[PDB]
């Protein structure tokens, strides 16, 4: 039974609002510069003000819905994308019976992991905007707001949105479910890296990776093959194809921007025409979406580290 | 051997500076508003009149360590990084590990070039972080972490290297971990003090002797109630170090006592407090041993009042 953060109860607070005919304004996280953590013309808007018929979830709560905005919370967002592949645990963190029509009182709740247990966090649905548009996390589908709201929820538990940026975890994700964070030096990898990744993905584990830098000015810089440096990616898959008379190990990556690697095994790359055309159809998706394949060899050369949250 | 953060090598950068006859200025963490933070320490009240000064500009003869690297040297300044500072205070009770994080062959005399290094735990390994010794100051004083001995600077510099690794000083405030301390050495366990285990005393004692890091705090139901002070001088929503357990004989029975330290360096006013009358009712030697009368942040409580007053105990087993 989850701890109520600051003793706020979603159900009793929603009822109070509904009965009063008001929308929730969270006294513990005001729509103020202190919630931002710091940029002109930021106005807080509810989804019901930006849209006539806002949806909480459209076509399922998926990684497609994870596009980073003007905030350096890549690790959190690559983590949420990874979490979408573990559907049962995603829907612990993101309660599904939440929407903008039934019982709508401008209030939402999420469950996070803090201090060896589940914590329930209540928020109001005012979200920072600039120019009629969400500043921070948004979905590919503009009528969809579950991920915008989830991110505000993490920001609340971290003190402000800015505290979400820069680090390799956040409050609500530290030792998630009481599991073991494991890290692999990709420059000295295990011989069975492919299997360890495949097993983790099958187990509903969370995997991400980054490219280390040697200068603060090189952070977020983009390589000649369109990788972003010092930037958390999701590992979203692995497959084996037969290429040039031998097995060929592939790894699938997703940039939390939602928009990619231009090297071997990239979306429009020529290696896909030298495999079983059936495999090209199944694997080579040609969408500018942040998600792409690399060979596992190219993966270990380009990136510094693999993280696995078991 | 530890990974060098941003590829920065202490020994070769230090010699470059000595050979140049300059003092190191870290190009990767400028003594600028950016190194401070974004809201409570961003551009514009707590940051008005901040001057960065090296300890050599603050003092005529600055020291790195004076009479040991000990918890009395951890006094929190105008920055809400209490979990970190309770962690570091806790870590001072594990000497072997403290001196892996704080390399001892550093000073302000021989080889001094305004550069220091510390090793932290990041991504399942040790990381070495280099800093210059320019520290934030206001009104002629350190703003953030300082020692009780004003000529001592190891802990001030340590907290600066944590700030660097975390992006800025502000990044160290608010949390129950920080970059360089997440899953320290492969280590965390949490006890609900309102439904505690029968053997809690023994769990704590074992952990303290293992050289584990122990800490505790009081939860709030209101954000405004953070850092509020109770009628018995406890601070709410505030990281404390657990630094000791003892059993004394009191009113015919064994009495279990726990020692806590406020990382402000300044205390519980109740039973077993510094000047509490209970002490005059146990063996005089145990009183001289245990009852130190110093406003230093550190005090005893009975384990019974501890579980009544505090919400949660963290144990980070190394
Ligand atoms: Ca969707
Ligand atoms: Ca592209
Ligand atoms: Ca793509
Ligand atoms: Ca000292
Ligand atoms: Ca004292």
Curated annotation (Swiss-Prot), chain A:
GO biological process, one term: proteolysis
Cytoplasm keyword on record: yes
Domain observations: The domain III mediates oligomerization.
Family membership: Belongs to the peptidase C2 family.
Domain Calpain catalytic: 23-310
Active site per UniProt: 74, 231, 255
Organism phylogeny: Eukaryota, Metazoa, Chordata, Craniata, Vertebrata
Summary of the tissues where the protein is detected: Stomach.
Subcellular location: Cytoplasm; Golgi apparatus
Keyword entries, A-Z: Autocatalytic cleavage, Calcium, Cytoplasm, Golgi apparatus, Hydrolase, Metal-binding, Protease, Repeat, Thiol protease
Known role: Calcium-regulated non-lysosomal thiol-protease. Involved in membrane trafficking in the gastric surface mucus cells (pit cells) and may involve the membrane trafficking of mucus cells via interactions with coat protein. Proteolytically cleaves the beta-subunit of coatomer complex.
GO CC list: cytoplasm; Golgi apparatus
GO molecular function: calcium ion binding; calcium-dependent cysteine-type endopeptidase activity
Domain of life: Eukaryota
UniProt-recorded name of the protein: Calpain-8
Keyword Hydrolase belongs to the record: yes
Record organism: Homo sapiens (Human)
Oligomer status and interactors: Monomer and homooligomer. Interacts with COPS1/GPS1, COPB1, EYA2, NME2, NME4 and TOMM70.
From Swiss-Prot, chain B:
GO terms classed as biological process: proteolysis
GO cellular component: cytoplasm; Golgi apparatus
Major location category of this protein: cytoplasm
Keywords: Autocatalytic cleavage, Calcium, Cytoplasm, Golgi apparatus, Hydrolase, Metal-binding, Protease, Repeat, Thiol protease
Record-annotated active site: 82, 238, 262
Keyword Calcium in record: yes
Tissue specificity comment: Stomach.
Localisation: Cytoplasm; Golgi apparatus
Protein family: Belongs to the peptidase C2 family.
Domain notes per entry: The domain III mediates oligomerization.
Subunit structure: Monomer and homooligomer. Interacts with COPS1/GPS1, COPB1, EYA2, NME2, NME4 and TOMM70.
The protein, known as: Calpain-8
Lineage, highest ranks first: Eukaryota, Metazoa, Chordata, Craniata, Vertebrata
